[PDB]
């Protein structure tokens, strides 16, 4: 064993906790990335409108 199994379980809890901490960071990074890509998209949208208007003058 009961102690051996309890030890193996504890071991996994520790390794998984490390992965959980990394998954928290990934969530924070993803929220940041969502904002950055939304802003990049807006700029691309505006550039496309202006390039289109430009093309139609000639």
């Amino acid at each position: 064993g009961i102690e051996g199994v309890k030890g193996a379980a504890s071991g996994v809890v520790g390794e998984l906790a490390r992965a959980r901490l990394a998954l928290d960071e990934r969530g924070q990074k993803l929220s940041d990335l969502e904002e950055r890509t939304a802003a990049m998209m807006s700029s691309a949208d505006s550039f496309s409108k202006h390039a289109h208007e430009m093309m139609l003058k000639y």
């Binding site: 802003a39 990049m40 550039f47």
Partner: peptide, 9 residues
């Protein structure tokens, strides 16, 4: 993403 945004702007 940010580099792209700068370049587009």
């Amino acid at each position: 993403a940010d580099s792209n945004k700068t370049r587009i702007d």
